[PDB]
């Protein structure tokens, strides 16, 4: 039916306000550690060409203003962890959930908790683009906002926000501090690669459209899989592996609609276009729903 993010509860109790100088951004507070982007130590004009390890030297424990809502936290140690600033604190988080750090593979979706000063503002779901970018909302002071999944009752942190590219797309790192894609914490000529459509997702969403009583785009047409990929190369789509076909199986078996039949339906949708019509109240093709967050939705 609708695009839905994960419950934000467990992550909300982890959001803190890390301020350094006139720089003030969000941070994640797990046990006696607080993570945030290492550019909090930078000033506006140091984002030109930054010497992070040397700037980090100027700083000492008293330079950081960690604020758990209203409780001000005593920072007892600072250390750089790639692009993230690791801060050992006095008082470990009592609200800390069971957590894991994951580096999600492109095409995978997660929920973002938008924060502006260490208190949550809103929550939405996006997807890791094949060119390693994200399409969210982040104005001033939103760096530090995290991205995550919740399986079972376990929080998998997989994103922190660092920068917006001069085209309106967003870039960041996992919780180890390592960037997704070829980007660096620096304001220089940094382009984004061409984006391709997450084919697998379009297919999964098509099944959800069928689940929901929208089946006009269907046909007794099938496709080889070798020919479909030619059509995909034509329309900036990701190609289809057998591994994509495999766990579309569960979805195929429910609706009794073969995967190759669904590709044939897609193939036609791209080639013919089928104007005026809407799939799940949308003319555009939706690639930000993984198979897993489709089975999960129903139910």
Ligand X SMILES: *CC(=O)CNC(=O)OCc1ccccc1
Active site residues: 39, 143
Residues 129-158 that bind ligand X (CB under 6 A): 140-143
**Contact string 99-118 vs a copy of itself (x = CB under 8 A):** --------------xx-x--
Q: How far is the CB of 209 from ligand X (least distance, A)?
A: 23
Which residues are CB-contacts of 10 (< 8 A; sequence separation ≥ 6)?
97, 150, 153, 155
- Please tell me whether residue 157 adopts helix, strand or coil conformation: strand
Q: Considering CB under 6 A, how many residues would be counted as binding ligand X?
A: 12
End-to-end CA distance of the chain: 11
Cα–Cα distance between 267 and 197 in angstroms, integer? 13
Q: What phi and psi, each to the nearest 5 degrees, are found at residue 272?
A: -80, -45
Taking a C-beta distance cutoff of 8 angstroms, is the pair 127, 107 a contact? yes
Tokens of 18: 């890390």
Chain-centroid distance, C-alpha 125: 7
Residues 207-236 that bind a copy of itself (CB under 8 A): 212-213
Q: Which does 7 bind (CB under 5 to 8 A by kind): a copy of itself, ligand X, none?
A: a copy of itself
Which residues are CB-contacts of 135 (< 8 A; sequence separation ≥ 6)?
126, 129, 169, 170
Q: How far is the CB of 19 from ligand X (least distance, A)?
A: 11
Q: Does 93 participate in binding a copy of itself (rule CB under 8 A)? A: no
**Contact string 2-31 vs a copy of itself (x = CB under 8 A):** xxxxxxxx--xx------------------
Q: Which does 118 bind (CB under 5 to 8 A by kind): a copy of itself, ligand X, none?
A: none
Q: Which residues bind ligand X (CB under 6 A)?
A: 25, 39, 47, 140-143, 162-163, 185-187
């Amino acid at each position: 039916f609708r695009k839905m993010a994960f419950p934000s509860g467990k992550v909300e109790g982890c959001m803190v306000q890390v301020t350094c100088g006139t720089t003030t951004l969000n941070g994640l507070w797990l046990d006696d550690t607080v993570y945030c982007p290492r550019h909090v130590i930078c000033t506006a004009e140091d984002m030109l060409n930054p010497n992070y390890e040397d700037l980090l030297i100027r700083k000492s424990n008293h330079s950081f203003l960690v604020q758990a809502g209203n409780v001000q936290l005593r920072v007892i140690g600072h250390s750089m962890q790639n692009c993230l600033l690791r801060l050992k604190v006095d008082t470990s988080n009592p609200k800390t959930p069971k957590y894991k750090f994951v580096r999600i593979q492109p095409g995978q979706t997660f929920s973002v908790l938008a924060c502006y000063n260490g208190s949550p503002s809103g929550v939405y779901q996006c997807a890791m683009r094949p060119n390693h970018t994200i399409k969210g909302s982040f104005l001033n002071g939103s760096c530090g906002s995290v991205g995550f999944n919740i399986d079972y009752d376990c929080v998998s942190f997989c994103y922190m926000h660092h920068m917006e590219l001069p085209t309106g797309v967003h870039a960041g790192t996992d919780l180890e501090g390592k960037f997704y894609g070829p980007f660096v914490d620096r304001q220089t000529a940094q382009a984004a690669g061409t984006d391709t459509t997450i084919t697998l997702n379009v297919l999964a969403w098509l099944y959800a459209a069928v689940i929901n009583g929208d089946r006009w785009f269907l046909n007794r047409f099938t496709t080889t899989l070798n020919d479909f990929n030619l059509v995909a190369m034509k329309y900036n789509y990701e190609p289809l592996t057998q591994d994509h076909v495999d766990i579309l199986g569960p979805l195929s078996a429910q609706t009794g609609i073969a995967v190759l039949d669904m590709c044939a339906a897609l193939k036609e949708l791209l080639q013919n276009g089928m104007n005026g019509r809407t799939i799940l109240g949308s003319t555009i093709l939706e690639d930000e729903f993984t198979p897993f967050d489709v089975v999960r939705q129903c139910s």
